[PDB]
Write an enzyme that holds these catalytic residues in place. Structure first.
Site, PDB file in Angstrom:
ATOM      1  N   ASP A  32      50.843  29.944  45.184  1.00 55.19           N
ATOM      2  CA  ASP A  32      50.752  30.888  44.124  1.00 55.19           C
ATOM      3  C   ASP A  32      51.753  30.705  42.996  1.00 55.19           C
ATOM      4  O   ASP A  32      53.109  31.265  43.128  1.00 55.19           O
ATOM      5  CB  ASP A  32      50.624  32.215  44.509  1.00 55.19           C
ATOM      6  CG  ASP A  32      50.134  33.169  43.527  1.00 55.19           C
ATOM      7  OD1 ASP A  32      49.879  32.700  42.254  1.00 55.19           O
ATOM      8  OD2 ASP A  32      50.562  34.460  43.308  1.00 55.19           O
ATOM      9  N   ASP A 217      48.865  29.593  36.593  1.00 56.14           N
ATOM     10  CA  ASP A 217      48.920  30.278  37.756  1.00 56.14           C
ATOM     11  C   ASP A 217      47.634  29.793  38.745  1.00 56.14           C
ATOM     12  O   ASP A 217      46.565  30.091  38.619  1.00 56.14           O
ATOM     13  CB  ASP A 217      48.311  31.896  37.440  1.00 56.14           C
ATOM     14  CG  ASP A 217      48.392  32.857  38.557  1.00 56.14           C
ATOM     15  OD1 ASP A 217      48.670  32.220  39.588  1.00 56.14           O
ATOM     16  OD2 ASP A 217      48.108  33.798  38.237  1.00 56.14           O
TER      17      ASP A 217
HETATM   18  C1  LIG Z   1      41.782  33.173  44.658  1.00 57.67           C
HETATM   19  C2  LIG Z   1      41.447  34.554  45.056  1.00 57.67           C
HETATM   20  C3  LIG Z   1      40.778  35.119  43.615  1.00 57.67           C
HETATM   21  C4  LIG Z   1      39.633  35.124  43.128  1.00 57.67           C
HETATM   22  N1  LIG Z   1      39.380  35.963  41.893  1.00 57.67           N
HETATM   23  C5  LIG Z   1      40.903  36.200  41.565  1.00 57.67           C
HETATM   24  C6  LIG Z   1      41.482  36.977  40.401  1.00 57.67           C
HETATM   25  C7  LIG Z   1      42.985  37.017  40.321  1.00 57.67           C
HETATM   26  C8  LIG Z   1      43.677  36.961  41.553  1.00 57.67           C
HETATM   27  C9  LIG Z   1      45.168  37.246  41.605  1.00 57.67           C
HETATM   28  O1  LIG Z   1      45.620  38.200  41.263  1.00 57.67           O
HETATM   29  N2  LIG Z   1      45.886  36.395  42.166  1.00 57.67           N
HETATM   30  C10 LIG Z   1      47.229  36.520  42.363  1.00 57.67           C
HETATM   31  C11 LIG Z   1      47.589  36.013  43.977  1.00 57.67           C
HETATM   32  C12 LIG Z   1      46.326  36.385  44.944  1.00 57.67           C
HETATM   33  C13 LIG Z   1      45.867  35.110  45.503  1.00 57.67           C
HETATM   34  C14 LIG Z   1      44.859  35.539  46.549  1.00 57.67           C
HETATM   35  C15 LIG Z   1      44.365  36.649  46.690  1.00 57.67           C
HETATM   36  C16 LIG Z   1      44.769  37.768  45.964  1.00 57.67           C
HETATM   37  C17 LIG Z   1      45.833  37.634  45.087  1.00 57.67           C
HETATM   38  C18 LIG Z   1      48.191  35.785  41.516  1.00 57.67           C
HETATM   39  O2  LIG Z   1      49.551  35.886  41.918  1.00 57.67           O
HETATM   40  C19 LIG Z   1      48.215  36.435  39.924  1.00 57.67           C
HETATM   41  N3  LIG Z   1      49.370  35.955  39.299  1.00 57.67           N
HETATM   42  C20 LIG Z   1      49.548  36.874  37.914  1.00 57.67           C
HETATM   43  C21 LIG Z   1      50.196  38.469  38.392  1.00 57.67           C
HETATM   44  C22 LIG Z   1      49.336  39.639  37.915  1.00 57.67           C
HETATM   45  C23 LIG Z   1      49.958  40.775  38.082  1.00 57.67           C
HETATM   46  C24 LIG Z   1      51.045  40.997  39.318  1.00 57.67           C
HETATM   47  C25 LIG Z   1      51.663  39.546  39.669  1.00 57.67           C
HETATM   48  O3  LIG Z   1      52.725  39.985  40.603  1.00 57.67           O
HETATM   49  C26 LIG Z   1      53.459  39.110  40.666  1.00 57.67           C
HETATM   50  C27 LIG Z   1      51.255  38.600  39.491  1.00 57.67           C
HETATM   51  C28 LIG Z   1      43.190  36.191  42.722  1.00 57.67           C
HETATM   52  C29 LIG Z   1      41.784  35.695  42.579  1.00 57.67           C
HETATM   53  N4  LIG Z   1      40.790  37.327  39.189  1.00 57.67           N
HETATM   54  C30 LIG Z   1      41.112  38.442  38.321  1.00 57.67           C
HETATM   55  S1  LIG Z   1      39.820  36.119  38.423  1.00 57.67           S
HETATM   56  O4  LIG Z   1      39.670  36.500  37.203  1.00 57.67           O
HETATM   57  O5  LIG Z   1      40.565  34.881  38.696  1.00 57.67           O
HETATM   58  C31 LIG Z   1      38.362  35.761  39.408  1.00 57.67           C
HETATM   59  C32 LIG Z   1      38.514  35.950  40.792  1.00 57.67           C
END
Ligand SMILES: CCc1cn2c3c(cc(C(=O)N[C@@H](Cc4ccccc4)[C@H](O)CNCc4cccc(OC)c4)cc13)N(C)S(=O)(=O)CC2
Length: 374
Positions: A32, A217
């Protein structure tokens, strides 16, 4: 040796094999670039095939501090500690690193995803609880002679790819590498200076594209866009594809679109070009995204007389996110040492017989405006 060391399932991230503790415990860890904490499941969970057992590691040290980390999707809480970590199909080194032992979580782990933890590859500034919690890659660089750079080649239900630590593997791309500056070292923040849908400029003040930041990201699936940009993009993609009418739910990512197997009308969907700030004043380059990227296949045997897709562009209130569907088919170099991100066409690039994903330049703009939002 590091080539093809990533695996994953579409829409669920890419992971690399790691070991934690002594004796080594093997875990699959999601890569990530959008966060900065290394964390692993450390208690039983319905969706975990295995987890980190601290009691079995003689090298584990408790830091006696809890931590909570909310992402865009999912959140977890855990206990901070340190332990020895290795990457069997990465650099052959062992480093002592901070590890969050996840003891409780909500909508974080994914049923059948095959990973049990997450490796935040960004900078300390966004680490939780604060920037004194040194991220893994920083520890890796400090403790070994590994060059301060890694690259990702994410390939488009089983998927694969390569994470190359410490250098660039020329076998993984073709053509030229184009670099965009890392604007600020927290996320991998970059600057988008122009967006076109099928060659047509969206014609917004370029600061709008970066409200309130734009990041690269790997842990996010979709291209996520600020509301104003998202609405403009959808209007334009609808117009280009108007020969067919889809339900509003499709454009909101709440519904699949399906065609008879093998008959997906790729040609009615436009190419999206994202122009990134170059390393020279008022210069830029573009990466071009084909519908094969932003229409994500949803594998389901029940629907398999058809090919079905989800719209993988979505609305954000936290700035632009160039997620996995954007990175797929490109070789992306995170050149931390020189504070820049490189893009090139990947060996596993996306293309049909009419169009090809591309990274190209240079482009010049007369407008002397700074496109950074802050
Ligand atoms: C890969 C799993 C996933 C599917 N989706 C999504 C998703 C977001 C994130 C997401 O938040 N990923 C973070 C890591 C993660 C990986 C797998 C499962 C859960 C979370 C990633 O780090 C986001 N990076 C930006 C961020 C945002 C807020 C706080 C943070 O704190 C440092 C970092 C994961 C998925 N959606 C909002 S999306 O629009 O891309 C569509 C669905």
């Amino acid at each position: 040796e590091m080539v093809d060391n990533l695996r994953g399932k579409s829409g669920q991230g890419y992971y690399v094999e790691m070991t934690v503790g002594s004796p080594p415990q093997t875990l699959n860890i999601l890569v990530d670039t959008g966060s900065s904490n290394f964390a692993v499941g450390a208690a039983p969970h319905p969706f975990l095939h295995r987890y980190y057992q601290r009691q079995l590691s003689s090298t584990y040290r408790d830091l006696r501090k809890g931590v909570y980390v909310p992402y865009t999707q999912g959140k977890w809480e855990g206990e901070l500690g340190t332990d020895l970590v290795s990457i069997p199909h990465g650099p052959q080194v062992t480093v002592r690193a901070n590890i969050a032992a996840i003891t409780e979580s909500d909508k974080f782990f994914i049923q059948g995803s095959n990973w049990e933890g997450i490796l935040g590859l960004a900078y300390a500034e966004i680490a939780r609880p604060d920037d004194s919690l040194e991220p893994f890659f920083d520890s890796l660089v400090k403790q070994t002679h590994v060059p301060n750079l890694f690259s990702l080649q994410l390939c488009g239900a089983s998927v694969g790819g390569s994470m190359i630590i410490g250098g660039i593997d020329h076998s993984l791309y073709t053509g030229s590498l184009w670099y965009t500056p890392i604007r600020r070292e927290w996320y991998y923040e970059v600057i988008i200076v122009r967006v076109e849908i099928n060659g047509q400029d969206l014609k917004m003040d370029c600061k709008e594209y970066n409200y309130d930041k734009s990041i690269v990201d790997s842990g996010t699936t979709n291209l996520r866009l600020p509301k104003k940009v998202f609405e403009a993009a959808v209007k334009s993609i609808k117009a280009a594809s108007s020969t067919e009418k889809f339900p509003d739910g499709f454009w909101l990512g709440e519904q699949l679109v399906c065609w008879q197997a093998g008959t997906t009308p790729w040609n009615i969907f436009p190419v999206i070009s994202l122009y990134l700030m170059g390393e020279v004043t008022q210069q830029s380059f573009r990466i071009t995204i084909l519908p094969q990227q932003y229409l994500r296949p949803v594998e389901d045997v029940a629907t398999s007389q058809d090919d079905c897709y989800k719209f993988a562009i979505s609305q954000s209130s936290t700035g632009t996110v160039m997620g996995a569907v954007i990175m797929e088919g490109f070789y992306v170099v995170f050149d931390r040492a020189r504070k820049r991100i490189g893009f090139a066409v990947s060996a596993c690039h996306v293309h049909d017989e009419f169009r090809t994903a591309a990274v190209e330049g240079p482009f010049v703009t007369l407008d002397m405006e700074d496109c950074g939002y802050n």
